[PDB]
Design an enzyme around this catalytic site. Sequence first.
Site, PDB file in Angstrom:
ATOM      1  N   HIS A 196       0.961  -1.256  -0.031  1.00  0.00           N
ATOM      2  CA  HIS A 196       0.065  -0.127   0.137  1.00  0.00           C
ATOM      3  C   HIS A 196       0.657   1.044   0.049  1.00  0.00           C
ATOM      4  O   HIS A 196       1.195   2.005   0.905  1.00  0.00           O
ATOM      5  CB  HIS A 196      -0.990  -0.022   1.233  1.00  0.00           C
ATOM      6  CG  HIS A 196      -2.123  -0.878   0.929  1.00  0.00           C
ATOM      7  ND1 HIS A 196      -2.392  -2.028   1.862  1.00  0.00           N
ATOM      8  CD2 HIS A 196      -3.275  -0.682   0.276  1.00  0.00           C
ATOM      9  CE1 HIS A 196      -3.641  -2.630   1.332  1.00  0.00           C
ATOM     10  NE2 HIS A 196      -4.065  -1.755   0.501  1.00  0.00           N
TER      11      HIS A 196
ATOM     12  N   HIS B 101      -6.560   7.451  -2.485  1.00  0.00           N
ATOM     13  CA  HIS B 101      -7.457   6.564  -1.813  1.00  0.00           C
ATOM     14  C   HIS B 101      -6.706   5.663  -0.763  1.00  0.00           C
ATOM     15  O   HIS B 101      -7.533   4.828   0.198  1.00  0.00           O
ATOM     16  CB  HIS B 101      -8.266   5.670  -2.831  1.00  0.00           C
ATOM     17  CG  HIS B 101      -7.504   4.404  -3.223  1.00  0.00           C
ATOM     18  ND1 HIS B 101      -6.270   4.620  -4.153  1.00  0.00           N
ATOM     19  CD2 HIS B 101      -7.709   3.348  -2.947  1.00  0.00           C
ATOM     20  CE1 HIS B 101      -5.883   3.303  -4.109  1.00  0.00           C
ATOM     21  NE2 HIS B 101      -6.621   2.608  -3.527  1.00  0.00           N
ATOM     22  N   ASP B 102      -5.231   5.759  -0.783  1.00  0.00           N
ATOM     23  CA  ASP B 102      -4.727   4.998   0.381  1.00  0.00           C
ATOM     24  C   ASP B 102      -3.514   5.722   1.184  1.00  0.00           C
ATOM     25  O   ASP B 102      -2.862   5.178   1.485  1.00  0.00           O
ATOM     26  CB  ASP B 102      -4.311   3.684  -0.178  1.00  0.00           C
ATOM     27  CG  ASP B 102      -5.002   2.239  -0.321  1.00  0.00           C
ATOM     28  OD1 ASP B 102      -6.039   2.425   0.726  1.00  0.00           O
ATOM     29  OD2 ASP B 102      -4.823   1.633  -1.082  1.00  0.00           O
TER      30      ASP B 102
ATOM     31  N   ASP C 247      -8.868  -0.240  -7.664  1.00  0.00           N
ATOM     32  CA  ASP C 247      -8.398  -0.767  -6.457  1.00  0.00           C
ATOM     33  C   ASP C 247      -7.714  -2.317  -6.696  1.00  0.00           C
ATOM     34  O   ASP C 247      -6.571  -2.475  -6.261  1.00  0.00           O
ATOM     35  CB  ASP C 247      -9.081  -0.896  -5.220  1.00  0.00           C
ATOM     36  CG  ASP C 247      -8.433  -0.205  -3.926  1.00  0.00           C
ATOM     37  OD1 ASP C 247      -7.058  -0.438  -4.089  1.00  0.00           O
ATOM     38  OD2 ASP C 247      -9.010  -0.185  -2.937  1.00  0.00           O
TER      39      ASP C 247
HETATM   40  C1  LIG Z   1      -9.746  -8.857   1.333  1.00  0.00           C
HETATM   41  C2  LIG Z   1      -8.458  -9.136   1.612  1.00  0.00           C
HETATM   42  C3  LIG Z   1      -7.630  -9.770   0.598  1.00  0.00           C
HETATM   43  O1  LIG Z   1      -6.384  -8.995   0.284  1.00  0.00           O
HETATM   44  C4  LIG Z   1      -5.984  -9.114  -1.031  1.00  0.00           C
HETATM   45  C5  LIG Z   1      -5.902 -10.252  -1.627  1.00  0.00           C
HETATM   46  N1  LIG Z   1      -5.151 -10.483  -2.579  1.00  0.00           N
HETATM   47  C6  LIG Z   1      -5.255  -9.338  -3.662  1.00  0.00           C
HETATM   48  C7  LIG Z   1      -5.438  -7.882  -3.166  1.00  0.00           C
HETATM   49  N2  LIG Z   1      -5.512  -6.768  -3.733  1.00  0.00           N
HETATM   50  N3  LIG Z   1      -6.126  -5.930  -2.900  1.00  0.00           N
HETATM   51  C8  LIG Z   1      -6.105  -6.621  -1.634  1.00  0.00           C
HETATM   52  C9  LIG Z   1      -6.803  -5.835  -0.330  1.00  0.00           C
HETATM   53  C10 LIG Z   1      -5.772  -5.911   0.722  1.00  0.00           C
HETATM   54  N4  LIG Z   1      -6.338  -5.005   1.617  1.00  0.00           N
HETATM   55  N5  LIG Z   1      -7.556  -4.473   1.147  1.00  0.00           N
HETATM   56  C11 LIG Z   1      -8.298  -3.751   1.973  1.00  0.00           C
HETATM   57  C12 LIG Z   1      -7.776  -4.885  -0.024  1.00  0.00           C
HETATM   58  C13 LIG Z   1      -8.938  -4.736  -0.924  1.00  0.00           C
HETATM   59  C14 LIG Z   1      -9.913  -5.593  -1.225  1.00  0.00           C
HETATM   60  C15 LIG Z   1     -10.915  -5.395  -2.227  1.00  0.00           C
HETATM   61  C16 LIG Z   1     -11.246  -3.982  -2.394  1.00  0.00           C
HETATM   62  C17 LIG Z   1     -12.389  -3.811  -3.223  1.00  0.00           C
HETATM   63  C18 LIG Z   1     -13.474  -3.552  -2.217  1.00  0.00           C
HETATM   64  C19 LIG Z   1     -10.258  -3.179  -2.243  1.00  0.00           C
HETATM   65  C20 LIG Z   1      -9.149  -3.496  -1.492  1.00  0.00           C
HETATM   66  N6  LIG Z   1      -6.068  -8.059  -1.781  1.00  0.00           N
HETATM   67 MG   LIG Z   2      -7.630   1.172   0.911  1.00  0.00          MG
HETATM   68 ZN   LIG Z   3      -6.028   0.628  -2.308  1.00  0.00          ZN
END
Ligand SMILES: CCCOc1cncc2nnc(-c3cnn(C)c3-c3ccc(CC)cc3)n12
Ligand SMILES: [Mg+2]
Ligand SMILES: [Zn+2]
Length: 340
Positions: A80, A120-121, A232
């Site tokens: 992030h 956004h982050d 995202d």
């Molecule tokens: C959900 C936990 C799994 O995390 C991930 C696992 N693999 C790939 C990935 N890419 N982004 C994430 C992720 C990490 N943290 N968060 C908050 C997200 C995420 C998730 C969804 C959205 C759409 C609403 C925005 C961000 N990823």
């Molecule tokens: Mg975020």
């Molecule tokens: Zn993000």
Amino acid sequence: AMDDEYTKLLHDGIQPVAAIDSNFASFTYTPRSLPEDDTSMAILSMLQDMNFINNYKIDCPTLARFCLMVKKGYRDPPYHNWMHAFSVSHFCYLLYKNLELTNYLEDIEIFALFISCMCHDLDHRGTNNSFQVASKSVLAALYSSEGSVMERHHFAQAIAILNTHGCNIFDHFSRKDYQRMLDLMRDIILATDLAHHLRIFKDLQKMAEVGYDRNNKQHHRLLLCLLMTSCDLSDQTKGWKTTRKIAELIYKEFFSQGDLEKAMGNRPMEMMDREKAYIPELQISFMEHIAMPIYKLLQDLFPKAAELYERVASNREHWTKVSHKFTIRGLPSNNSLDFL
Ligand SMILES: CCCOc1cncc2nnc(-c3cnn(C)c3-c3ccc(CC)cc3)n12
Ligand SMILES: [Mg+2]
Ligand SMILES: [Zn+2]
């Protein structure tokens, strides 16, 4: 190379997007292949290509200063960080280019989307929402009643940047449009909370079933929500190498939060527990349950978006394939059983 940086950024031209890379505006371009040194210039190329600079008579000094202040507002956890923000912003630009957003949304909405993508982050620390709450962080202290703790902070940080002298790229809007723009950013940024997405998922399906109505105001809201969450997660629309490498950084970040929670005496979520986490099933689940439905919804609204869903589905199959490699067969590379 920091003030060197503002100067070049401001006093040269802004490069034409095509000059950045001949495929810069296609869905197969991987933004993270651009050097981090060139990304601020790239943001400006896209803004100029999308015609927002010369539309809104934005102060090139102000805009270039905005950009660098946004970049600098990111820390450097494994996932992030600014290059995340950059490739998220880049996907937004792709959506505008390949899907023809101007037929769907007002210029102001698109501007608010792109800009919310950059921001956004902001100031992310590599910990999630439940960490903020569990650890009674000062962010959880301020935003204490409604969740989206981090997202509330990301918006707060974006606000404080616009309110830094020489950084208000909105100080040309009417007070009416200025407010509208801020409420737009709050809504779009807030939509990046996965809990938000799960709440409105049913409403997204409905809109996709009946079809986007540009005179429906609630459709505008849902569209912007879906488009932002598509941004995202856009790393999942590229190659296998990209999902693979994004899994590395994600898990590196998550596991650090888990190690910290253990040290505080909390019990981490499994996906954050490096002792318990099985990365291949976590990915497939994430792909199958989160990212796939997003790009399917996008395919349903936007038929030109179909290649993206099929990429995301193809990335899932591939985790299925290499999933067996997470049980060590034969001997390790060194021909040794020491790791035991
Ligand atoms: C959900 C936990 C799994 O995390 C991930 C696992 N693999 C790939 C990935 N890419 N982004 C994430 C992720 C990490 N943290 N968060 C908050 C997200 C995420 C998730 C969804 C959205 C759409 C609403 C925005 C961000 N990823
Ligand atoms: Mg975020
Ligand atoms: Zn993000």
